[PDB]
Amino acid sequence: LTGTGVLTESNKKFLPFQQFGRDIADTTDAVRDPQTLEILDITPCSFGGV
Amino acid sequence: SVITPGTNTSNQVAVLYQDVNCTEVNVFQTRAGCLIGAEHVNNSYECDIPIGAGICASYQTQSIIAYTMSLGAENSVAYSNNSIAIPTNFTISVTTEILPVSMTKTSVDCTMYICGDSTECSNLLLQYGSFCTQLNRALTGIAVEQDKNTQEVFAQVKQIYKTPPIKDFGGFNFSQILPDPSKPSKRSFIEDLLFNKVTLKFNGLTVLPPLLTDEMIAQYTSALLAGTITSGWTFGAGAALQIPFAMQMAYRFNGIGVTQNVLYENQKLIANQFNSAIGKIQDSLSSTASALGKLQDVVNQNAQALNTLVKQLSSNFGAISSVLNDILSRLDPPEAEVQIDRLITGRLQSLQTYVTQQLIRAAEIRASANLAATKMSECVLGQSKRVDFCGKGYHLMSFPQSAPHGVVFLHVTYVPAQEKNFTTAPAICHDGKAHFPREGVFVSNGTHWFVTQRNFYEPQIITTDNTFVSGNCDVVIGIVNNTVYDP
Amino acid sequence: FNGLTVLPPLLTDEMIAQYTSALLAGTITSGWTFGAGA
Amino acid sequence: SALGKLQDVVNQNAQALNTLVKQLSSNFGAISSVLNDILSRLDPPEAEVQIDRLITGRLQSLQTYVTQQLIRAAEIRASANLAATKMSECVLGQSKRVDFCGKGYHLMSFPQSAPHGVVFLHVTYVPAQEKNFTTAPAICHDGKAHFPREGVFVSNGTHWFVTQRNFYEPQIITTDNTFVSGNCDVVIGIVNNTVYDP
Amino acid sequence: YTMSLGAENSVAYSNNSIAIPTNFTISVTTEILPVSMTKTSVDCTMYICG
Amino acid sequence: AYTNSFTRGVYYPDKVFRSSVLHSTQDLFLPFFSNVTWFHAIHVSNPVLPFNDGVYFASTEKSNIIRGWIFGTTLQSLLIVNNATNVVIKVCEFQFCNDPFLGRVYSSANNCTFEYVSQPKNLREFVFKNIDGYFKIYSKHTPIDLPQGFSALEPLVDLPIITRFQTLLAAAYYVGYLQPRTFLLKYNENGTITDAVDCALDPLSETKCTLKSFTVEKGIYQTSNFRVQPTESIVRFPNITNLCPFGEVFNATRF
Ligand SMILES: *[C@@H]1O[C@H](CO)[C@@H](O[C@@H]2O[C@H](CO)[C@@H](O)[C@H](O)[C@H]2NC(C)=O)[C@H](O)[C@H]1NC(C)=O
Ligand SMILES: *[C@@H]1O[C@H](CO)[C@@H](O[C@@H]2O[C@H](CO)[C@@H](O)[C@H](O)[C@H]2NC(C)=O)[C@H](O)[C@H]1NC(C)=O
Ligand SMILES: *[C@@H]1O[C@H](CO)[C@@H](O[C@@H]2O[C@H](CO)[C@@H](O)[C@H](O)[C@H]2NC(C)=O)[C@H](O)[C@H]1NC(C)=O
Ligand SMILES: *[C@@H]1O[C@H](CO)[C@@H](O[C@@H]2O[C@H](CO)[C@@H](O)[C@H](O)[C@H]2NC(C)=O)[C@H](O)[C@H]1NC(C)=O
Ligand SMILES: *[C@@H]1O[C@H](CO)[C@@H](O)[C@H](O)[C@H]1NC(C)=O
Ligand SMILES: *[C@@H]1O[C@H](CO)[C@@H](O)[C@H](O)[C@H]1NC(C)=O
Ligand SMILES: *[C@@H]1O[C@H](CO)[C@@H](O)[C@H](O)[C@H]1NC(C)=O
Ligand SMILES: *[C@@H]1O[C@H](CO)[C@@H](O)[C@H](O)[C@H]1NC(C)=O
Ligand SMILES: *[C@@H]1O[C@H](CO)[C@@H](O)[C@H](O)[C@H]1NC(C)=O
Ligand SMILES: *[C@@H]1O[C@H](CO)[C@@H](O)[C@H](O)[C@H]1NC(C)=O
Ligand SMILES: *[C@@H]1O[C@H](CO)[C@@H](O)[C@H](O)[C@H]1NC(C)=O
Ligand SMILES: *[C@@H]1O[C@H](CO)[C@@H](O)[C@H](O)[C@H]1NC(C)=O
Ligand SMILES: *[C@@H]1O[C@H](CO)[C@@H](O)[C@H](O)[C@H]1NC(C)=O
Ligand SMILES: *[C@@H]1O[C@H](CO)[C@@H](O)[C@H](O)[C@H]1NC(C)=O
Ligand SMILES: *[C@@H]1O[C@H](CO)[C@@H](O)[C@H](O)[C@H]1NC(C)=O
Ligand SMILES: *[C@@H]1O[C@H](CO)[C@@H](O)[C@H](O)[C@H]1NC(C)=O
Ligand SMILES: *[C@@H]1O[C@H](CO)[C@@H](O)[C@H](O)[C@H]1NC(C)=O
Ligand SMILES: *[C@@H]1O[C@H](CO)[C@@H](O)[C@H](O)[C@H]1NC(C)=O
């Protein structure tokens, strides 16, 4: 599940069986920490045109 | 293919098989192929849904019928030699014409889209040369073209005219269409409907803001409108010259051959028709929500295409997995040099398709925006005599209104009504001269003979001032006799 | 053919002839007026 | 800077053509963009794979150029039809459509050649130095209402004149620059004068 | 800066006032239109394969 | 005996969270409005039932009168029992009796190769799938002619372990075989499945599925190719007859 982003605590209400989670763009968008079962919500780091 | 009245009308549906006879699987057979589930019905109507070859389908007393479409109410207009019909009355009418002016200024960070910040993938893609720069140039081109469009349509007015306070426009009630100091924004009352009756998180892709913010396009349109409301055509040609609005309307009637006294003898009535037409233009927009579909379509269509550009990012193209990180983790780098090449070429080709689609749509919207610019230039700043350019009528004037990506012109067209049937003659013979009508046309009901103006029954005694002498009462194909008076 | 096909036009040639007959009968009978109203 | 609108098409086309040249050096993940080199380095069973890679890339680039040139040609054709329409309507004529043959009221136009374009000198009448006059829509006299035949009524503060619409030139009100209807009741704002009778 | 749309001014409207131009300025405006590209041609085989 | 299903037999297909979104799935499901058989929960004569492609099961009862299952081929055999506050899920019932009357026991058992145990007017429902070396036990229940109310089953179990099955019988129970229907699932903002479209139920259902929308505006839409399948595989060959001369060229007295 490699990637980059900022990881945030989230209200995203994963049901107890769900072990990774994807957005409407089909990218992985939220995941559960396999050491602690916390919900971590991904978003990519800030970027743009200069 | 299926035909349906759509879920929110009914659950019922019928099916068309586009090129196979019903022997090959209620039923009907058409030049468009076999049709199943629709009852063929024997009279005719306008097309609710097109099928083909003159078959159309619609929902009616309930079931899906299919029918031969009817082009309209067949009527023999009672042509004759010797006969003319002249309208005794009129009905001013206001019609929306809705034109898209811009699409959203999409911009794609091409290397971030294709390669996801992989230092591997971009090191591959660099060996494709100009592509990933060229696409960004092309999208920037259409993006700048969207501001070029919006300025080229709204910024005709050289200055922001502010409307006078008292709004004493001869009984016309523009409070429905001017800005409101109740100030949810600069928007006008109708504009506040348009900004609601249509309505519309990413990697690589972004939406740049429009250069003219919506409150500022509304400011321009308020200026254009205060111009037409207070200065007629004159603010297009030079400085705005004030003129009383009733006199402006009198000029515009005099622009469509109706003599301007026909305005002043009816002004109280005329304004009441115009206000009611504005009320209908409000009430229709407040409920027939589909009427802005010409704008909603482009917003949907763009959003559709861009959405598929995201969806294509998820597709393998034959690569071992649809995520450069997930392959690059598991594959050996010499084989990843093949798998990532498959992903790169697939993604790049899909992006090339999107960029070409947006270039084609941008060319179309540029055509629409130029049509909107000429519409504003002729119909708003002027009075175009072009027989159907500014709506289905004789053109009086038009008012612009801003809409989220377009203009919604309220063309106000004079449509005549309540015809009468008169006998007529090309010329009136007296003393052996033939007299011809200087600007009207001759009409009679048989008892006597009169001249009238061409578009409104106002009879005058025929009087050797409204008519000019010519010929010698023998070359005219169908002359008639009368006692032409002489002041 | 395979894959390729031609859909029929919505307005067959009979109806295009019917409309242009209507536009002739209009212009002949009534000039500009039938564009603006009855 | 005035000719920018015309210089751009020369620049864009040159730019597109220039990148079509630069894409020959692209290499596309062959081992060299100079094809005669890979043709010397590798034996035909390999070289055919490398050349297939180059051919695929070069096609893709050329297909891009030709497609964009079609789009651009469609634009320039739409501009050419606009130019042909303005040549017809503004030069051979006096098209009265308010803001087509330049700003102002259009008088005439002169075409001029430019290297891939046309420059029109649109010659236009623009009014200036206006003054403020009181008005009425009609003049009441003997209870008839006289309306202006082609001008409008204006007041010189305290005497009433007809003037043509777009250039102040007063005339005494007469039977011949006015016409008569009504009963001095239905028209609002009617005002009184001794309309003269020659 | 925030863009200016232009010097805001009131039309001196009133229900009985007209402004009539006492004079004129005939003027000349250039308009510039492109009417062709260059007639490019590409010898496709000589481009791809030399 | 029969009754029709409604919008039931639908479950979270992939153990992956999605929300405020629509998604297209090709796993096995109970087709909407498929008939589900109804069977005697009482031993009035309970028939014992075939298992194909996975079973939707439901039982309507207070007091958990339906309380167990057995599965297998010629029923090594999966066994499930819920009595005495434990879900017992052994695969040990290798000699399940010819009449598995619940209580004193359904079977004779040996070689319990897998023996997982877990904590175990009202409608209880299940789906049993076997796939890829797993047995998936989706289940859900709600207080109360099955309801027309939609309900998405959560995975109650998914076990790393069949042709017929039987149940450890005032109650009733319903059975229906799944099929591999494409579904479009709509996920609420809370990530529960709120509605679904069977992409084969009718041509409108197919159109809904093809636009990826529930509301279809009035109009005409493409949906599919219609290509007739060939009725037969004819073969004609040139009436040629003898074996070829290879027995010379691989065996010549001198190459
Ligand atoms: C011309 O038409 C208008 C309507 O378009 C007529 O005005 C209506 O007349 C009826 C009958 O008197 C009234 O009930 C309506 O209220 C009038 N309309 C409005 C808006 O007030 C008018 O009478 C017609 N005049 C002629 C000469 O035909
Ligand atoms: C139209 O018809 C009416 C009646 O047929 C005509 O009205 C008469 O016109 C004369 C001359 O203007 C008047 O002296 C009469 O008083 C009118 N009749 C009445 C009852 O007042 C009218 O002239 C006809 N017009 C035409 C052009 O034929
Ligand atoms: C504009 O108004 C002035 C007065 O306000 C007019 O002055 C007189 O006009 C009358 C006829 O209208 C002449 O008989 C007088 O000789 C005028 N007096 C002067 C001092 O000129 C003036 O005529 C009006 N404008 C024009 C062009 O006549
Ligand atoms: C109309 O405008 C023209 C242009 O300004 C005026 O002509 C100018 O008049 C001033 C004053 O005599 C001179 O200094 C300029 O040299 C003139 N320009 C030209 C090109 O000759 C003209 O006087 C104005 N006329 C009226 C009636 O307003
Ligand atoms: C569909 O019907 C509902 C009422 O059931 C209404 O609120 C909605 O506006 C309708 N939508 C369309 C597109 O007709
Ligand atoms: C198939 O349909 C067409 C429609 O015009 C008709 O002409 C033709 O005879 C039909 N053939 C059969 C076998 O029904
Ligand atoms: C339509 O009308 C004709 C009248 O001649 C009739 O013969 C025919 O059956 C009708 N068609 C249908 C579908 O009822
Ligand atoms: C204009 O119409 C509105 C109703 O839309 C009304 O409230 C307002 O008073 C009217 N103003 C006039 C007639 O001046
Ligand atoms: C004119 O007269 C003809 C013949 O009676 C009639 O058909 C037609 O409808 C009349 N038109 C009007 C406008 O009265
Ligand atoms: C046609 O109209 C003219 C003019 O009134 C008349 O002389 C001629 O007799 C008319 N012919 C017919 C056939 O009505
Ligand atoms: C008009 O009058 C003259 C003389 O009275 C007559 O010769 C002529 O025929 C009349 N017009 C027509 C059309 O008959
Ligand atoms: C007309 O008069 C007003 C004062 O009432 C003034 O502000 C305005 O500038 C004048 N207009 C012209 C064109 O002189
Ligand atoms: C213009 O408005 C005033 C009131 O402000 C009014 O007295 C006057 O009559 C109006 N003008 C006309 C021509 O009615
Ligand atoms: C014009 O004169 C009549 C009678 O002299 C008078 O009743 C009327 O009021 C005058 N016009 C105006 C606008 O006052
Ligand atoms: C359900 O069963 C009945 C009786 O066996 C049958 O007639 C019906 O077709 C079945 N339902 C469907 C949807 O086929
Ligand atoms: C366990 O399996 C073996 C092999 O099938 C069988 O012989 C034995 O009887 C089984 N255990 C018992 C207790 O029967
Ligand atoms: C969604 O979840 C929140 C948090 O538990 C809850 O308050 C809300 O009622 C839920 N709504 C729906 C429609 O599931
Ligand atoms: C040719 O065809 C027949 C089958 O129709 C086959 O049985 C026969 O042996 C063939 N003839 C010869 C001479 O081999």
- Pocket probe for ligand 13: among D187, D188, D192, the residue whose CB has the most ligand atoms within 8 Å is D188
Rounded to a whole number, what is the distance in Å from the CA of B390 to chain A's nearest CA?
43
Q: Which residues of chain E have a CB within 8 Å of the CB of B163?
A: 11, 13
CA distance D109 to D102: 9
* CA–CA distances in Å: residue D90 to residues D82, D85, D102, D127: 11, 8, 9, 20
**Which residue has the least CA distance to atom 12 on ligand 8?**
B173
**Cβ neighbourhood burial of B447 (10 Å; 0-12, 13-18, 19+):** exposed
CA count, 13 A, side-chain hemisphere, B43: 5
Question: Residues B201-225, buried b or exposed e (16+ Cβ, 10 A)?
Answer: eebbbeebebebebebbbbbbbbbb
CA distance B91 to B419: 12
State yes or no: chains C and E have 3 or more CB pairs below 8 A.
no
- Pocket probe for ligand 16: among F74, F92, F111, the residue whose CB has the most ligand atoms within 8 Å is F111
Q: What domains can be seen in chain F, in order of their start residue?
A: 2-227 (2.60.120.960)
Q: Which two tokens stand for residue F128?
A: 């049993």
Window 2-31 of C: residues touching B by CB (8 A cutoff) are 5, 7-12, 14-15, 18-19, 22, 25-26, 28-30
Q: Say how many Å lie between the CA of residue B172 and the centre of ligand 8.
A: 9
Q: Which atom of ligand 8 is nearest to the CA of B282?
A: 5
Q: Which residues of chain F have a CB within 8 Å of the CB of A37?
A: none
CB contact under 8 A, F221 and B2: yes
Amino acid letter, residue B468:
F
3-class SS of residue B450: strand
**Which segments of F37-193 does DSSP mark as H helices, in order?**
none
Q: Say how many Å lie between the CA of residue B420 and the centre of ligand 11.
A: 27
CB contact under 8 A, B3 and F220: yes
Out of A4, A26, A49, closest to residue B314 by CB: A26
Amino acid letter, residue F217:
E
Which one-letter DSSP state was computed for residue D186? S
Rounded to a whole number, what is the distance in Å from the CA of B314 to chain A's nearest CA?
7
CB contact under 8 A, D128 and E24: yes
CA distance B238 to F161: 88
| A36 interfacial to chain B (CB closer than 8 Å) | no
3-class SS of residue F177: strand
CB contact under 8 A, B50 and C10: yes
Q: Which two tokens stand for residue D77?
A: 């054709």
Query: Residue C1's closest chain B neighbor by CA?
Result: B19
Are B86 and B443 in contact, with CB atoms under 8 Å apart? yes
| B73 interfacial to chain C (CB closer than 8 Å) | no
3-class SS of residue B465: coil
Rounded to a whole number, what is the distance in Å from the CA of C9 to chain B's nearest CA?
6
Are B38 and B46 in contact, with CB atoms under 8 Å apart? no
Residue bearing tokens 């008005």: D135
Are F203 and F223 in contact, with CB atoms under 8 Å apart? yes
Q: Which atom of ligand 16 is nearest to the CA of F95?
A: 14
Are D177 and D171 in contact, with CB atoms under 8 Å apart? yes
Out of B155, B158, B244, closest to residue E16 by CB: B244
CA distance C1 to B250: 64
Which one-letter DSSP state was computed for residue F83? -
Amino acid letter, residue B180:
D
Q: Which residues of chain F have a CB within 8 Å of the CB of B13?
A: 202-204, 207
Q: Which two tokens stand for residue D189?
A: 């704002």
Out of B7, B49, B59, closest to residue F220 by CB: B49
Amino acid letter, residue D150:
E
Residue D129: in which H helix or E strand, if any?
strand D117-134
- Picking from D195, D64, D198, the residue whose alpha carbon sits closest to that of residue D139 is D195
**Cβ neighbourhood burial of B386 (10 Å; 0-12, 13-18, 19+):** exposed
- Picking from B414, B406, B408, B409, the residue whose alpha carbon sits closest to that of residue B381 is B409
- Picking from B73, B78, B15, the residue whose alpha carbon sits closest to that of residue B420 is B78
Q: Which two tokens stand for residue B259?
A: 């003599």
Q: Which two tokens stand for residue D141?
A: 């006299």
Q: Say how many Å lie between the CA of residue F123 and the centre of ligand 15.
A: 23
Q: Which two tokens stand for residue B122?
A: 């971009």
F239 contacts: CB under 8 Å, gap ≥ 6: none
CB contact under 8 A, B2 and F218: no
Q: Which two tokens stand for residue D149?
A: 């035949």
Q: How many CB atoms lie within 10 A of CB B336?
A: 21
B372 sits in the region (left: phi over 0; alpha: psi -120 to 50; else beta) called alpha
Contacts for B312-315: CB closer than 8 Å, 24+ residues apart? B312/B347, B312/B350, B313/A25, B313/A26, B313/B113, B313/B347, B314/A25, B314/A26, B315/B346
- Picking from C17, B162, B377, the residue whose alpha carbon sits closest to that of residue D97 is B377
Q: How many CB atoms lie within 10 A of CB E21?
A: 21
Are B260 and D153 in contact, with CB atoms under 8 Å apart? no
B174 contacts: CB under 8 Å, gap ≥ 6: B167, B225, B229
